[PDB]
Amino acid sequence: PVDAWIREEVEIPEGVEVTVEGYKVKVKGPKGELEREFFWPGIQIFTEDGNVVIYKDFPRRKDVAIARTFAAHIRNMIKGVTEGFTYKLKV
RNA sequence: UUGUCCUCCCGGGCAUCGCCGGGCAGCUACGCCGCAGCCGAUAAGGCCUGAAAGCAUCUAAGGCCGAAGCGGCCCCCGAA
């Protein structure tokens, strides 16, 4: 164990709604709605106040990496449902 | 058609089917007819998202494509 516990928080903007039904996180916003299944043994995802919390007790290196990856993915979901993503290519 | 025998003529036996030329049915090949490129997952390899490691990163979790090779379509045997 690298720490007693790991807690990661993702802020929820006013226009964004986030729900957690088990291991599946659903993010709904003005521009659409997405759902993704974030699973990893011992990692719990829930909501507190205006934040999404990814929490685990006595995490290891891989556990910390997975938690940070999940936080990044959820933040990407929020950004996509808020403003969206644009990619550019040139011929 | 050659030698010989049945006396000669017709018609026959033997000589590798006596030897020689042609030969339908049958069997044959030297002859003739038939033999799919589509889907699914992958190896090597090419990428997307993403942290550990506030950045970067195809990889750790996750996703896409990708071989005459693997599974099926197909052919043959198949109620002990």
From Swiss-Prot:
Source species of the chain: Pyrococcus furiosus (strain ATCC 43587 / DSM 3638 / JCM 8422 / Vc1)
Record's protein name: Large ribosomal subunit protein uL6
Family: Belongs to the universal ribosomal protein uL6 family.
Subunit structure: Part of the 50S ribosomal subunit.
Domain of life: Archaea
Gene: rpl6
Role noted for this protein: This protein binds to the 23S rRNA, and is important in its secondary structure. It is located near the subunit interface in the base of the L7/L12 stalk, and near the tRNA binding site of the peptidyltransferase center.
